[PDB]
Amino acid sequence: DIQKQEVREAVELPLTHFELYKQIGIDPPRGVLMYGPPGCGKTMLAKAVAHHTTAAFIRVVGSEFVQKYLGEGPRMVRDVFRLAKENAPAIIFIDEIDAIATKRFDAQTGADREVQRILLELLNQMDGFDQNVNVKVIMATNRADTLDPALLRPGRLDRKIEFPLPDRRQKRLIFSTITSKMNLSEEVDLEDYVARPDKISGADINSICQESGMLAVRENRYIVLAKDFEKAYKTV
Amino acid sequence: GLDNQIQEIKESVELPLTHPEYYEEMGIKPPKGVILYGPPGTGKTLLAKAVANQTSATFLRVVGSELIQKYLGDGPKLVRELFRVAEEHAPSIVFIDEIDGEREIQRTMLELLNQLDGFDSRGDVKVIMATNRIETLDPALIRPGRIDRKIEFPLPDEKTKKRIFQIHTSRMTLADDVTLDDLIMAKDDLSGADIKAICTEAGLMALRERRMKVTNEDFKKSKENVLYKKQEG
Amino acid sequence: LDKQIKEIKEVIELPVKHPELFEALGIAQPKGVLLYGPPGTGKTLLARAVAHHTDCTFIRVSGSELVQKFIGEGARMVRELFVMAREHAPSIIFMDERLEGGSGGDSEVQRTMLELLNQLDGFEATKNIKVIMATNRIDILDSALLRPGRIDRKIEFPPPNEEARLDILKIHSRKMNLTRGINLRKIAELMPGASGAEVKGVCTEAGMYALRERRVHVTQEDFEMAVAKVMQKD
Amino acid sequence: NLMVCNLAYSGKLEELKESILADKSLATRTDQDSRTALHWACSAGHTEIVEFLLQLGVPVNDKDDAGWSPLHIAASAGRDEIVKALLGKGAQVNAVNQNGCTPLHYAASKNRHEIAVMLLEGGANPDAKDHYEATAMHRAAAKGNLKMIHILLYYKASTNIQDTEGNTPLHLACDEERVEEAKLLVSQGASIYIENKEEKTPLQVAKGGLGLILKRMVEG
Structure with missing residues (x-):
């Protein structure tokens, strides 16, 4: 809503697909940072972006290039960046940089230091590739303590979106988008089931609705009710 | 109100070798020392008694637990260093100050209590522990450590800093219009070297302009240092 | 861009031709210099331009x-940074990283530059070691209460003026295409507010209206709309 | 799970009317959920079926294992003719369900204007509270229904109800950033000085300086 609103305004406006940026330079940024202390979040957002923007999406985990060959990184930025600037403007989902953004000194487990030196390699490549390229690389995280001042340099991560704990907007609209497809009842009410998460903190409300569907697929009851919503709240 | 407290710690920790004939004749021997704790703390009773006891003695400075928490949990190795140099400095006074995850603090505090209790030596040196809040320390430290005496500081806010301010400003010079209501009403968790520090930076701040008088707004500007010092840490 | 280089040549360029x-x-060495004014432009373009014409290194303290x-x-x-300063003699250092919280929290960096100017003023084991003060809050009057003044260079830093937006607006106008029916005196002398970075906000935020109106070049009306945009916030 | 669930859910008119006229046991058959053909017929939106049931005089006070009367559930459906027949019979307009939410919270939740005018017209409490101590203006003003707020202003609804946390409808309007609704409620008597358990006034709960223009709407 507001998070996808700031991301959308920060993505689709620079990616308006016009050649006039190449003459006067790439003024608008391309990197956007996100947040969210639910169950790692950052998934249904890119799902909604996939619903709206019917384009390519490089879905990769945050720990995909940790292979002992150490060459997967340069091969993915080389091949994926060349097919992004050459084939079509895509959205490369390089998420979960908190596990690969921690400082490391000892050379025993210094593989994280080697892949952060690869992060320095592509860190200079993206500086050399600031002109004449149709690329949009998103990069988010869920921790603000293990970050380094190198990534926070202007021109790389120019957006710092925060996420509230209750965040009643995404909860109400996620109830609307989960009730717009799945079945529903007239007794089903969202008043205390969106007001109570404002008083008590939680996560994965959509997955709690899916747990209510698990407690409703028991075939003992034909239509899901509120007892599985509140019971799913107290259980998970 | 600290005369009875300073004569009770004077008789408590100055009964040993310094004027010793009243300690090894009656046969009491509480050779464990006291554990300093002050409701304001932060060098007030710690520094006041740390400089007041230095009339004739040997002082041993141990301030802050940063060297333990700033890196890996080295633990009681530096306690063994201070215990072998305290063994080579037996007629001294062990002064541990600023005693401020928990799974290791409890085991280095357990080993600290074990080595500090005198598990391998008899009573020969006076060990003094210090902290800001006596409630954060686990009560398991009181029985082995404190068997001699524990001192509370019931300070009258007007006469503690007005008596210490009067004595400490009766020999040196100062300025006029030095208020006290905002001092006794606002200051907390600070020392006497802090009121002396703001009178010294107050008269010194007036000395920057080459003046001997301090304005009330300048004493509030120096007071702001006290206002933020208690809110920072 | 002449009143700042004419005053920085004797601060950085002095140990070059001597x-x-x-x-x-x-004269042994110039000790330090401070530039009061919000870091809109020239915060790193001056030390990185002269350092670009010096080919030295850039080592920061940034206590964190x-x-x-x-x-x-x-x-x-x-x-340790002074050991790396004897090992690396050409090194330009830039001090970059309320009166209530900033007094102490910024007084850590104030103590850092006090002991750095007391090591430079103390002894000279190696040359080309220079520090630049950058404080643009109440802590520049508190710094002025802490700066002794005896060892200090005074270079005027105009973000609260207009010429520092005229020259940097021309520099930021040489890279992109601009029209000929433009007057930089009203659109560059009539831009007060936060700092000189809102000029870069006028160019970057003006590109959205230049591409929005399909203008192949940049006009003055676009700079006016971008002036409104940079005057929306701050 | 019973027969009246598929006959009262899958759209059976003449088989259900013949099932009632043939044997009253099917008409008074209850399942494990403690529901009759009125609950399932109101669940599927059956107009003529509930007109026949309410015509014969089915007990409307029948609740489930939680306490959900067909007026809370069918008023939570937002159907026009169903609530017209239920209020035509004169059901309990202020009965308590499992959470305590009166049918006014359900008429205000679904933005049903006629159901709110007809519930509040028959004697329903305009400021009734549930177990969560919240009224229909917390949720009606929080969801973003301005016309529901206006027709609550027609029935003299209070604007400073304390929530179980201590919030007011102005706190649930500033938290949702409803500009015109907070300006209306403030222009109706919403106190900007009420504090919840978080020790925060509605000026601090709103974002973007909205409490300053709400204070402007207080002093002017």
């Missing part, structure tokens, strides 16, 4: 996490 005999016959352990295991943070 051999080692001037260390025992003339991830740097207190890299520069030595444990010290006062002004001795």
